[PDB]
């Protein structure tokens, strides 16, 4: 009854964290079938089924995108940490926060049920027509309705987050004293509210094309219109999944350096510039569909601008570590690893922005290596940095430092050996979304499938890190959740704290 009828933010955030762990387990299971079909030339364990391989990659991409990183960063750490960090007693709409969580298990259930109906939804996670429309049966409708339910969940969560930050701050605390995780969650909520309904409209058009015999994307329609609407949604979507990671990395790096964050207003402005530029660059996913050269020209020139705010954020993190008193712990290694390895994920994005180069590497494994650098090593490292940072506060359990270092090194080795060879495959022209490849692509495919098993082993080793905790008493901190007891009370902040400005 506690975990079904909750109105507290700390319980709903923990429910999000557990649901995100379940989604990560499902996606990791779906990702071993991909790398085990792709280990050797010919036909592997899927018995030469291409529809089943397409179903597997569709389900894997949708699950790891929407049901793992999004509920962990936005719904998980955001719901637990936002009202404590700003000093709010609760969320603004506590029963809306519960339906924000409780629309996610119906969506995941519909997505998993679509795999068992007819031949499944083998379309890719983008679901381009007329491939989505040609599929006889019911599975594609279930997958798109799963997408609708997840989108409505994210919209309602963003509504609650935006009213909470605006209207329930502590007295004396303006929008200058909030830590950078709060700013990241607020800008993420703004992006969600602006971008998700475009996807909802596009999927409504897809439903009417599939089932109502309409003419949105058909013989007499326009198939480029779907790609326009979908990528206008989908490129803000990948900055929704990465800004809370920036906030977490700011909090972690600031903590263990014994220093405040370098260039606070520059950090906020860089996050805002990233948020604003994400809505006008979306047709960098559509360089090969046959657009006019002026459109291609503008979207090439505009996409390269996003590098400058990100470079300022990275150099500001490095200046935060600079001239400090740094103690390297397990969450600290997950943030230094973030800084060193998100750079490798962004430099290839610069290459992909230039449309002349993108004529060669569109829909190859160069793209895949890029977006597994920025997601499996930017967002996953951000998720795991906060688990070893706030875990004793959130769950009450400590962790063994040695097994956590074992888990970190296993994950770090297993991801640098899975996707670094996928660059060379894509430069040599190996296409995406294929299970049988040419005989000369065998060596890097073997190395990548070797790396995936190391990744799976590090997934297994993570379950053995938890242990009992030691509880102490706080006196002072720089953020408001490190003066609370571990775990805090059900109504944390019994008295609402105020921020007093001194005579200076």
């Amino acid at each position: 009854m506690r975990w079904l009828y909750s109105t507290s933010h700390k319980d709903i955030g923990l429910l999000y964290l557990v649901f995100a762990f379940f989604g990560g387990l499902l996606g990791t299971s779906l990702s071993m079938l991909i790398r085990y079909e792709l280990a050797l030339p010919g036909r592997g364990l899927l018995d030469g089924n291409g529809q089943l391989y397409n179903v597997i990659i569709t389900g894997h991409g949708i699950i790891m995108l929407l049901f793992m990183v999004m509920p962990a960063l936005f719904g998980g750490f955001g719901n637990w940490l936002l009202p404590i960090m700003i000093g709010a007693p609760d969320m603004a709409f506590p029963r809306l926060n519960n339906i924000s969580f409780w629309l996610n298990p119906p969506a995941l259930a519909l997505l998993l049920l679509s795999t068992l109906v007819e031949q499944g939804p083998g379309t890719g996670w983008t679901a381009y027509p007329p491939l989505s429309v040609q599929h006889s049966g019911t599975s594609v409708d279930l997958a798109i309705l799963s997408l609708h339910l997840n989108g409505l969940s994210s919209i309602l969560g963003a509504v609650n987050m935006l009213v909470t930050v605006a209207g329930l701050r502590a007295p004396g605390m303006k929008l200058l004293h909030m830590p950078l995780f709060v700013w990241a969650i607020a800008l993420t909520a703004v992006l969600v509210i602006l971008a998700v309904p475009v996807l909802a409209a596009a999927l409504v058009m897809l439903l009417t094309d599939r089932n109502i015999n309409t003419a949105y994307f058909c013989e007499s329609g326009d198939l480029i219109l779907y790609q326009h609407l979908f990528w206008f949604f989908g490129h803000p979507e990948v900055y929704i999944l990465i800004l809370p990671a920036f906030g977490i990395v700011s909090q972690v790096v600031s903590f263990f350096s014994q220093k405040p964050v370098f260039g606070l207003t520059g950090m906020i402005c860089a996050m805002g510039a990233i948020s604003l530029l994400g809505f006008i660059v979306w047709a960098h996913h559509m360089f090969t569909v046959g657009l006019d050269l002026d459109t291609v020209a503008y979207f090439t020139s505009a996409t390269m601008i996003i590098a400058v705010p990100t470079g300022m954020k990275i150099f500001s993190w490095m200046a935060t570590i600079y001239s400090g008193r740094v103690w390297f712990t397990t969450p600290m290694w997950f943030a230094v690893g973030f800084i060193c390895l998100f750079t490798l994920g962004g430099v290839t994005g610069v290459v992909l922005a230039n449309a002349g180069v993108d004529m060669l590497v569109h829909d190859t494994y160069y793209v895949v290596a890029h977006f597994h650098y920025v997601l499996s090593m930017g967002a996953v490292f951000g998720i795991f940095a906060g688990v070893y940072f706030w875990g004793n506060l959130i769950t009450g359990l400590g962790y063994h430092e040695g097994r956590a270092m074992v888990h970190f090194w296993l994950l770090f080795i297993g991801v640098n050996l899975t996707f670094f060879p996928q660059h060379f495959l894509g430069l040599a022209g190996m296409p995406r979304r294929m299970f049988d490849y040419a005989d000369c692509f065998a060596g890097w495919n073997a190395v990548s499938s070797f790396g995936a098993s190391i990744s799976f082993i590090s997934v297994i080793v993570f379950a053995t890190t938890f242990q009992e905790a030691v509880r102490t008493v706080p006196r002072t901190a720089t953020t408001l959740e490190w003066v609370l007891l571990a775990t805090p009370a059900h109504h944390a902040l019994s008295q609402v704290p105020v921020l007093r400005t001194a005579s200076s």
Binding site: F255, Y399, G402, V406, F450, I454, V470
Partner: protein, 104 residues
Amino acid sequence: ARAQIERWAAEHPTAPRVGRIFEVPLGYVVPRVAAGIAAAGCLWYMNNTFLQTYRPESLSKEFLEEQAKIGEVAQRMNAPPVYLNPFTNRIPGSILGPEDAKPE
């Protein structure tokens, strides 16, 4: 900024503070990651050995030796054969194919 550091170091007593960059000793970390890498290698080997339903005939040693006899040469239905990828294999521009070369 120091007090939250000292509080986190008390709630996480297994994390050592001894004065070195890698605080956990490598004698603990290296054998366990080696064992994990070995288990991953065993899973990869099991997939390669026992989980294939069709091995291609173009990877048999007879096909491979007969291909290595030919080299990187492509046939044409309207022309003499041509050396594939002439820049990386350093074919000079005068030579177009095997048969058109007719070695001196």
